[PDB]
Design a protein around this ligand. Structure first.
Ligand SMILES: C[C@H](OP(=O)(O)OC[C@@H](O)[C@@H](O)[C@@H](O)Cn1c2nc(=O)[nH]c(=O)c-2cc2ccc(O)cc21)C(=O)N[C@@H](CCC(=O)N[C@@H](CCC(=O)N[C@@H](CCC(=O)O)C(=O)O)C(=O)O)C(=O)O
Ligand SMILES: C[C@H](OP(=O)(O)OC[C@@H](O)[C@@H](O)[C@@H](O)Cn1c2nc(=O)[nH]c(=O)c-2cc2ccc(O)cc21)C(=O)N[C@@H](CCC(=O)N[C@@H](CCC(=O)N[C@@H](CCC(=O)O)C(=O)O)C(=O)O)C(=O)O
Ligand SMILES: [Cl-]
Ligand SMILES: [Cl-]
Lengths: 135, 127
């Protein structure tokens, strides 16, 4: 396990795994507090500890992120895995959307246009994962 | 709601995430294998008894099992309980081996059994 805050740095191996191309699951909570888990891409900025998901505004995952205010982003590749937990909010500012799209293209590829795109921003505070990555 | 293509995806070898809730209701999400029986709609995770994921399954009673392979993905949601019966554990180990490979021996192994009530996933897998 590791805490994440202004004084922390994830291990080099964990950061590498986060920069490599991997798909993930986004977990949020529904209004009844049941977990909502859906496949996404995401990006993680080690300088700010902000994880981003681009998605459609008003989509279920966006509604939950906004309403309950928390999210987890989780990826696995065999023995390596990580879950990044934190506080979440939805940003619909078009310049923030563009910044998110540019970040997404680095990890994945240029995304298809989406006039209703928003960003879920997650301020990562705790990480779970495989023992070799943590540190 | 699960099509033939969804059932095939569930039998193919893929790793997954198990989501449970901690005591404070925050989601605990960890990499696992799982098996799914289409006849009974039971999904199973084998794990160590007293492990965090097992504690949460027992305490909060809810789980999700979620897998992705590119454009294909599914999340199977339902009510969860922990079964430590030695014949249930052996049966869950054999099922795990069908999908993955024979698991390491572990006398403290238990089964998180999830009765799947709701499925989310890619549109092309759902009916
Ligand atoms: C992440 C960890 O959860 P866990 O201990 O349930 O999970 C351990 C492993 O099962 C995972 O690493 C799992 O991902 C490994 N794994 C799998 N595990 C499987 O089981 N089955 C599979 O099929 C499987 C397949 C698989 C495939 C690929 C792969 O990459 C990994 C795979 C955790 O929360 N860790 C916490 C600590 C948890 C903790 O505190 N544990 C306590 C026991 C629980 C407990 O006492 N909890 C207290 C709280 C204690 C506290 O405050 O610290 C409570 O709930 O009241 C202890 O070790 O003694 C942390 O990072 O800090
Ligand atoms: C699964 C779905 O949630 P979603 O609509 O938030 O997600 C749609 C897609 O984004 C996902 O399929 C996602 O996995 C697609 N996807 C990606 N999506 C991305 O967005 N970003 C990515 O980077 C991404 C990458 C990616 C990579 C690989 C891959 O295979 C897939 C990828 C869901 O809950 N569906 C429910 C229905 C939900 C619902 O009711 N939606 C409401 C709107 C939300 C709402 O207002 N909800 C109400 C409740 C509605 C009710 O009562 O039912 C509320 O919470 O108050 C509606 O359509 O009207 C179901 O099937 O049953
Ligand atoms: Cl999008
Ligand atoms: Cl185990």
């Amino acid at each position: 396990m590791a805490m994440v805050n202004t004084t922390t740095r994830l291990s080099d191996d964990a950061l590498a795994f986060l920069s490599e191309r991997h798909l993930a699951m986004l977990t949020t909570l529904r209004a009844d507090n049941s977990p909502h888990v859906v496949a996404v891409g995401f990006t993680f900025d080690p300088k700010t500890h902000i994880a981003r998901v681009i998605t459609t505004g008003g989509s279920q995952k966006a509604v939950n992120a906004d309403r309950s205010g928390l999210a987890v982003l989780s990826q696995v590749d065999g023995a390596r895995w990580l879950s990044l937990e934190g506080r979440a909010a939805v940003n619909s500012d078009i310049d923030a959307v563009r910044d998110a799209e540019l970040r997404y293209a680095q990890r994945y590829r240029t995304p298809r246009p989406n006039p209703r795109r928003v960003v879920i921003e997650v301020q990562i505070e705790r990480v779970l994962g495989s023992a070799d990555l943590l540190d």
